Amino acid sequence: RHLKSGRKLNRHSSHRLALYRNQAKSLLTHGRITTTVPKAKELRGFVDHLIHLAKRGDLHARRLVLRDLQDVKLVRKLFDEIAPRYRDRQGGYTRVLKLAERRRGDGAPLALVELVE
Amino acid sequence: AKHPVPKKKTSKARRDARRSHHALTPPTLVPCPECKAMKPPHTVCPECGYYAGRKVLEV
Amino acid sequence: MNRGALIKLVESRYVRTDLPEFRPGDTVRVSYKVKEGNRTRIQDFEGIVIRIRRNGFNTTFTVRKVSYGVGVERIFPLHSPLIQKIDIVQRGRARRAKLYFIRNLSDREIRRKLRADRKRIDQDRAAERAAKEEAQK
Amino acid sequence: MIQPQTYLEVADNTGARKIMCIRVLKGSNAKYATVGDVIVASVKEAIPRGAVKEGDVVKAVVVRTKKEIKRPDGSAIRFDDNAAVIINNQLEPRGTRVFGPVARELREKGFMKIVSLAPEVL
Amino acid sequence: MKGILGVKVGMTRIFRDDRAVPVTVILAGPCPVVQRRTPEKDGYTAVQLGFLPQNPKRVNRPLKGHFAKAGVEPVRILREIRDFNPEGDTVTVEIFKPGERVDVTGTSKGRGFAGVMKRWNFAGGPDSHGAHKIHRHPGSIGNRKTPGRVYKGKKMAGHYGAERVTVMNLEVVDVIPEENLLLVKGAVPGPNGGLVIVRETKKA
RNA sequence: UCGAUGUCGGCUCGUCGCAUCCUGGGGCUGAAGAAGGUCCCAAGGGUUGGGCUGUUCGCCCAUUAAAGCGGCACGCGAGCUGGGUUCAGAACGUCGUGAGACAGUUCGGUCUCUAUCCGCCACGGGCGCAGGAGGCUUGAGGGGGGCUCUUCCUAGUACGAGAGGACCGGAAGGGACGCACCUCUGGUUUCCCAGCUGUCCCUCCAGGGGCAUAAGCUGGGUAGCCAUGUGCGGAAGGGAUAACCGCUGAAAGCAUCUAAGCGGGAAGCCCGCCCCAAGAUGAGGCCUCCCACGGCGUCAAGCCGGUAAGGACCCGGGAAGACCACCCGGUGGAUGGGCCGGGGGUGUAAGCGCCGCGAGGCGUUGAGCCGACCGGUCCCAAUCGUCCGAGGUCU
RNA sequence: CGAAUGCCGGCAUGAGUAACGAUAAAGAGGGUGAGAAUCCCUCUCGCCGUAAGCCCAAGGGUUCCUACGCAAUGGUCGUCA
RNA sequence: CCGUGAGGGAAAGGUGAAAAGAACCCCGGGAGGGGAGUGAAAUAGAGCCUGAAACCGUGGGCUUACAAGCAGUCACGGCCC
Ligand SMILES: [Mg+2]
Ligand SMILES: [Mg+2]
Ligand SMILES: [Mg+2]
Ligand SMILES: [Mg+2]
Ligand SMILES: [Mg+2]
Ligand SMILES: [Mg+2]
Ligand SMILES: [Mg+2]
Ligand SMILES: [Mg+2]
Ligand SMILES: [Mg+2]
Ligand SMILES: [Mg+2]
Ligand SMILES: [Mg+2]
Ligand SMILES: [Mg+2]
Ligand SMILES: [Mg+2]
Ligand SMILES: [Mg+2]
Ligand SMILES: [Mg+2]
Ligand SMILES: [Mg+2]
Ligand SMILES: [Mg+2]
Ligand SMILES: [Mg+2]
Ligand SMILES: [Mg+2]
Ligand SMILES: [Mg+2]
Ligand SMILES: [Mg+2]
Ligand SMILES: [Mg+2]
Ligand SMILES: [Mg+2]
Ligand SMILES: [Mg+2]
Ligand SMILES: [Mg+2]
Ligand SMILES: [Mg+2]
Ligand SMILES: [Mg+2]
Ligand SMILES: [Mg+2]
Ligand SMILES: [Mg+2]
Ligand SMILES: [Mg+2]
Ligand SMILES: [Mg+2]
Ligand SMILES: [Mg+2]
Ligand SMILES: [Mg+2]
Ligand SMILES: [Mg+2]
Ligand SMILES: [Mg+2]
Ligand SMILES: [Mg+2]
Ligand SMILES: [Mg+2]
Ligand SMILES: [Mg+2]
Ligand SMILES: [Mg+2]
Ligand SMILES: [Mg+2]
Ligand SMILES: [Mg+2]
Ligand SMILES: [Mg+2]
Ligand SMILES: [Mg+2]
Ligand SMILES: [Mg+2]
Ligand SMILES: [Mg+2]
Ligand SMILES: [Mg+2]
Ligand SMILES: [Mg+2]
Ligand SMILES: [Mg+2]
Ligand SMILES: [Mg+2]
Ligand SMILES: [Mg+2]
Ligand SMILES: [Mg+2]
Ligand SMILES: [Mg+2]
Ligand SMILES: [Mg+2]
Ligand SMILES: [Mg+2]
Ligand SMILES: [Mg+2]
Ligand SMILES: [Mg+2]
Ligand SMILES: [Mg+2]
Ligand SMILES: [Mg+2]
Ligand SMILES: [Mg+2]
Ligand SMILES: [Mg+2]
Ligand SMILES: [Mg+2]
Ligand SMILES: [Mg+2]
Ligand SMILES: [Mg+2]
Ligand SMILES: [Mg+2]
Ligand SMILES: [Mg+2]
Ligand SMILES: [Mg+2]
């Protein structure tokens, strides 16, 4: 027994990280992302941080963000377009809404991971 | 083909008695407030679209 | 109930505040000791501070010395049995937080890997403020 | 924590150099020996013509331990090696001198002459 | 038989004379006496104490105002002390004085389904040499044809923890009345924020 | 039992007997005391670690209060091991002309992921508890636990030529064991922080990312989980008894513990202590709630649909957890996520400036980064809703 | 015919149980479609690279290409093969 | 089909008198069905005469959550027909 602690899984470390890294990229790229509930929830916090460093905009934040999102252009958009969109918002730049119906293939329950507004 | 095997054929009664719990339970739905439709609670269904909540198509 | 931590920092009103600031450089000294009847006679313990584990009221630190051919380390709570805690060379200048590494290859090598903290020492002799002009205004 | 099999370093001039714990003399089945506790050991190494020889089954008291020793005031002491002093059947030191520091627990456990003879008691 | 409810807040240590004292801080907040058991109507004697204030309105039916002590009707339900009967108003930490010996009860932490080794601190199998598929196994559990069965509760793997546990005779190292605090000498079942009941011990 | 009941020893896990090794009571002693011997009572709890041999067993080493003897398919291989022995190879001695052989030795040799029923450990679901509910409880009856040593004080006193050396009573420490805990001590902490190599890449320098485990390596390391660490426990006390010791007392003018009646008396027995427990259908108790016939059969459900108190469903979660369950929240909201502050860990980020040809070094700087921990803040998410559920049979 | 661990066939039990075949690894956005986590495309990510790349001989025999297709064969799915 | 080979060696018959083999409509991607229609018969609708038993279901009647058994039998009693 454990879970006395936090964070989810079902992949080894390097994979689990690489995962959040990709959803993040895909989310900042499209605004709305559809994935399974667990993956969606675990995403919210990881990207909220990324955007919060954007709000700073001091380069260090930039190079910190680039560590997870390697796409220079992506970050640019992140720092010039998405970031301002909040700047006054105190956290919670991410939204997650579960859809009805599941994958008629494995029955996985899906959800929405939206960039909020 | 190995080690433990069942000793006797489980009788029809005994077999069915075990499935006394396999009975399925109905999906839980509720009337959508925006349209006339049934959908699961705390979920965005196609029909309506959620007072904006990133919905399907509609003109 | 509403602030375990708070309602715990409140019991911890056994907190000293008369002790010198120091990291993993070189402290030593101290301290009390109750032997053969009386809680008197203060024994001193000179040495390099090998570690400091912080945890509010009960953060502790260990000091290492080489007493008569044998190496010895002592763990002090930080509050209670500690009359004074003056300190030798500020030395410090340890790139590491926990320097148990000095245990296996100590000697001249220790003083070479632990150069004086040319800095914290400066603000030691500087920020001292020894002006005995008192009573003249 | 000393258990049968452990090698201690003799902190005295009885001639011995190293002894291996054979048993901890505390009860019917104590698991470990700490500073102050007595043991029976085998003399593994010894210096030419000394009060004791190798193969000798002796007794000694533990004066130093690599496992830290906690004092009721909340502090702890610990040494780089495990050392003991050869003791006779009446529990006095067979030697005359003693080297290195000894934990002070020895004082509160009776071993007075070992402590007086010790170059330092921490 | 002095008895109060409280919540485990956490533990640290203090200094008395010149020795460190591991201690468990408890919060035996103002307990509103809400009911009394009597050999006439209840058949035994006891004080249902109330604990943990507030609770907007999620109380419904058990709106036990039968006693004005309905004081917002506390959260952490009610709990009897048995063989206690104080000034029918409120039981505070004052009940205890530094130096007394209490018996504290709580629900131990839950390790869920435990292995024979952790649960019944079993020895288990070897990590090498012989086989290598029963290093954490119970071994044998019976004899042969006779008795040809297994003794009732022969210690086996299963649920472990999350149960009532009482550790006895703890010195009340102190008691801070202004804050409802209470200091015992270490060891107290359950997790911080867990409910406990502190009573008078049984030593004489 | 040969259409198969796996065989020695060990490991694991116990459980029982008592013909008792220790511990507790006691009688006799060639019992001064102390230490023994012997027999009776008594398993409640204990009954160590090693060297040798496959060994059981024994013999040693060092201790101990003691290092008990037996049963349970010489307990336990659908639990493990396979060292002994009983397949095929090979060799020695030995027997045989030989092929081969030997309760003689020697080296080597495949012990089958899936538990149906009973039993056992745990967790539910259904219905019942003769109104329905939400709480708090009694404890029939079970289970757990029961250990023991040393020293000091009585008192160097009774006893004793001496040496030695008590009872009874009273203290303080230990050892094993048990439960719980994480303050401390000490572990782990798979990405919390830093350092490092080779290579490919981003973007050339700088700064970074992947890979070199399912962590590349190294040094550290919070929460949690932990023992080596910490705190508690065995009781005390009441009752009936064993052996045993008596009081009063006949039968039997004495005597006698017995026949009548009364006592004292064990680590044992009962209760006390901790835990479970009303499926204790013998379904218990106390507190508070909601209560009505409205439509309808043989007129109190034998009846249908809304209901009531309440309850599920769904959601956000949890030192709760395999699932289920249990516990806390659901905008009348601090439940989780984020954001903020603080702990805590890393141990002076980048960038820029100065010094050095350069690797680098100063400074800004305990900086930067930063899981779980203690708390704030409705920024995001627990939108909105639905379905069950009384109308209560007898003197 | 009731038995022969009988013979041929059918259907049960175990059971919604063990399994679904290397721990190199996935994510998302488009498209197609009655329906696809499983087909197509784009972008990320991971693996092999004395290869898990390329070529020849043997063996195999149309498995090659393409258009219609999805009952079955594919350990799931299938519009794909 | 098996085996390198000598060689071994299966299973599998029946619409109806006559194809009159179900136009067309409806749900469905199809399959499959519901109507319509053929026929004396379609539970003769196509691996279709008859179509038993094991086995799997739906509906109903009696009966069961304090009992324990080679499952039956004898006796009363209740409910249903
Ligand atoms: Mg990796
Ligand atoms: Mg974060
Ligand atoms: Mg059936
Ligand atoms: Mg748990
Ligand atoms: Mg082990
Ligand atoms: Mg094996
Ligand atoms: Mg039996
Ligand atoms: Mg048989
Ligand atoms: Mg006997
Ligand atoms: Mg005597
Ligand atoms: Mg036995
Ligand atoms: Mg067996
Ligand atoms: Mg063998
Ligand atoms: Mg072998
Ligand atoms: Mg070999
Ligand atoms: Mg009872
Ligand atoms: Mg019973
Ligand atoms: Mg710790
Ligand atoms: Mg720790
Ligand atoms: Mg630590
Ligand atoms: Mg790094
Ligand atoms: Mg690199
Ligand atoms: Mg790569
Ligand atoms: Mg930790
Ligand atoms: Mg008499
Ligand atoms: Mg009597
Ligand atoms: Mg009596
Ligand atoms: Mg209870
Ligand atoms: Mg019952
Ligand atoms: Mg009941
Ligand atoms: Mg009741
Ligand atoms: Mg919150
Ligand atoms: Mg919050
Ligand atoms: Mg914070
Ligand atoms: Mg800090
Ligand atoms: Mg900080
Ligand atoms: Mg911080
Ligand atoms: Mg037949
Ligand atoms: Mg016959
Ligand atoms: Mg037959
Ligand atoms: Mg057959
Ligand atoms: Mg089946
Ligand atoms: Mg299942
Ligand atoms: Mg099964
Ligand atoms: Mg299973
Ligand atoms: Mg499986
Ligand atoms: Mg596969
Ligand atoms: Mg696989
Ligand atoms: Mg790899
Ligand atoms: Mg590679
Ligand atoms: Mg290679
Ligand atoms: Mg060819
Ligand atoms: Mg073909
Ligand atoms: Mg092709
Ligand atoms: Mg095609
Ligand atoms: Mg398929
Ligand atoms: Mg062939
Ligand atoms: Mg017709
Ligand atoms: Mg016909
Ligand atoms: Mg015909
Ligand atoms: Mg037919
Ligand atoms: Mg039939
Ligand atoms: Mg039926
Ligand atoms: Mg009964
Ligand atoms: Mg009945
Ligand atoms: Mg009958």
CB-based contacts of D49: which residues, under 8 Å, 6+ apart? D15
B18 CB contact with strand H at below 7 Å: no
Distance E162 CA to F220 C1' (A): 35
Q: Is chain B touching chain A, with at least 3 CB–CB pairs below 8 Å?
A: yes
Q: Tell me which residue of C99, C118, C112, C102 sits closest to C24, measured CA to CA.
A: C99
CA E83 and chain centroid, separation: 18
In Å, what is the separation between the CA of E65 and the C1' of F309? 17
Contact criterion met (CB < 8 Å) for C11 and E192? no
* Surface of E (2-21) touching D: CB under 8 A: 13, 15, 18-20
Cα(E158)–Cα(E112) distance, rounded to whole angstroms?
Answer: 8
Count chain C–chain E contacts defined by CB atoms under 8 A. 47
Q: What is the CA radius of gyration of chain C?
A: 18
**Torsion, Cα of E124, E129, E133, E135 (10° steps):** 20
Q: Which residues of D touch E19 (CB under 8 A)?
A: 72-74
Which of C8, C77, C61 lies closest to E23, judged by CA?
C8
CA of E105 to C1' of F293 (A): 52
**Using an 8 Å Cβ cutoff, are D63 and C72 in contact?**
no
Among residues A74, E66, E53, E12, the alpha carbon closest in space to that of C55 is found at E12
Q: Nearest chain E Cα to D76, which residue?
A: E20
Cβ-proximal residues to A5 (8 Å cutoff; 6+ apart), any chain = none
Q: How far is the CA of D25 from the C1' of F49 (A)?
A: 12
Contacts of residue E46, Cβ cutoff 8 Å, sequence gap at least 6:
E36, E37, E80, E81, E82, E83, E84
In the numeric block, the tokens 């005359």 are attached to: D96
Q: Report the SS3 class of residue A44.
A: helix
- Give the number of other CB atoms < 10 A from CB of residue D74: 22
| CA pair distance E72, E51, nearest whole angstrom | 11
**CA E13 to each of CA C77, E10, E23, E197: distance values in angstroms, whole numbers, following the listed order:** 11, 11, 5, 21
| The three-state (H, E, C) secondary structure of chain B, written as one string | CCCCCCCCCCCHHHHHHHHHHCCCCCCCCEECCCCCCEECCCCECCCCCCCCCCCCCCC
**How far lies B24's CA from each of B19, B20, B27, E81, E190, in Å?**
11, 11, 9, 46, 38
Please provide residue E99's backbone torsions phi and psi, each rounded to the nearest 5 degrees: 115, -20
H runs (alpha helix) in chain D: 112-117
Asked if E6 and E198 touch (Cβ cutoff 8 Å), the reply is: yes
Give me the phi and psi of A78, to 5 degrees please.
Answer: -55, -45
- In order of A16, B5, B6, E134, the CA distances from B2 in angstroms are 40, 7, 11, 20
Report the distance separating Cα E78 and Cα E55, nearest Å: 14
Q: CA D98, CA D84: separation in Å to the nearest integer?
A: 10
With contact defined as beta carbons under 8 Å apart, do C71 and C64 qualify?
A: yes
Q: Chain C: nearest CA to D18, how far in angstroms?
A: 16
Residue with tokens 């309905």: E70
Q: What is the resolution of this structure in A?
A: 3.0
Cβ pair B42:A112 closer than 8 A: no
- Residue of chain A minimizing CA distance to B39: A100
Helix (H) or strand (E) holding A103: none
CB atoms within 10 A of CB A87: 9
Strand partners, C74: C63, D77
DSSP E strands in chain C: the ranges are 48-53, 60-67, 70-76
Cβ(B44)–Cβ(B30) below 8 Å? no
Residue B10 Cβ < 7 Å to strand H: no
Residues of B in contact with A94 (CB under 8 A): none
* DSSP per-residue string spanning E8-74: EEEEEEEEETTEEEEEEEEE---EEEEEEE-TTTTSS-EEEEE-S---SS---S----SSTT-TT--
Number of Cβ within 10 Å of residue B7's Cβ equals 6
Pairing of strands D83-87, D7-10: parallel
Sheet holding A109-114, edge to edge: A32-36, A109-114, A95-102
Query: Which residue from C69, C74, C103 is facing D77, i.e. has the nearest CB?
Result: C74
Instruction: Find how far residue D102's CA is from the centre of its chain.
Output: 9
Nearest CA in chain D to E13: D74
How far is residue B11 from each of residues B1, B16, B23, measured CA to CA in Å?
21, 9, 20
* Counts of helices then strands in chain E (DSSP H, E): 1, 12
Chains that touch E (3 or more CB pairs under 8 A): A, C, D
Distance CA A39, CA A2 (A): 20
- Cα(A47)–Cα(C74) distance, integer angstroms: 46
Q: Which residues contact D111 (CB under 8 A, 6 or more apart)?
A: D36, D61, D91
Q: How many Å apart are CA C117 and CA D101, to the nearest integer?
A: 31
Q: Any atom of strand H under 7 A from CB of B19?
A: no
Determination technique used:
X-ray
CA-CA distance, D65 to D67, in Å (whole number)?
5
Q: Contact D101/C70 with Cβ under 8 angstroms?
A: yes
CB atoms within 10 A of CB D35: 24
Closest nucleotide over all strands to E163 (CA to C1'):
F275
Chains with ≥3 CB–CB distances under 8 Å to D: C, E
D60 DSSP 8-state letter: E
Q: Where are the beta strands (DSSP E) in A12-108?
A: 32-36, 95-102
The owner of tokens 């001292």 is C128
Closest by Cα among E90, E102, E140 to E26: E102
* Distant-in-sequence, close-in-space partners of A30: CB < 8 Å, separation ≥ 6: none
DSSP result, A50-67: HHHHHHH-SSHHHHHHHT
DSSP state of C35: B
Residue type (1 letter), D30 = A
Distance CA E9, CA E13 (A): 13
